[PDB]
Amino acid sequence: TXPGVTXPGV
DNA sequence: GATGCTTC
DNA sequence: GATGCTTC
């Protein structure tokens, strides 16, 4: 997730 | 070191 | 099955 904690996603 | 899901 | 790395 994020970044942080990508997206999701990417 | 945690860490985290979403679309692709 | 592949992604996507940061801020915390």
Nearest-angstrom CA–CA distance, A10 and A4: 11
Q: Which residues of chain A come before a gap where C and the next N are over 2.5 Å apart?
A: 5
Task: Report the nearest residue to nucleotide C7, CA vs C1'.
Answer: A4
Which distant-in-sequence residues (6+ apart) come within 8 Å of A7 by Cβ? A1
Nearest nucleotide, CA A5 to C1': B4
Task: Report the nearest residue to nucleotide B3, CA vs C1'.
Answer: A5
Nearest nucleotide, CA A6 to C1': C4
| Residues A9/A2, Cβ–Cβ less than 8 Å | no
Which residue's structure tokens are 């904690």? A5
Task: Report the nearest residue to nucleotide B5, CA vs C1'.
Answer: A8
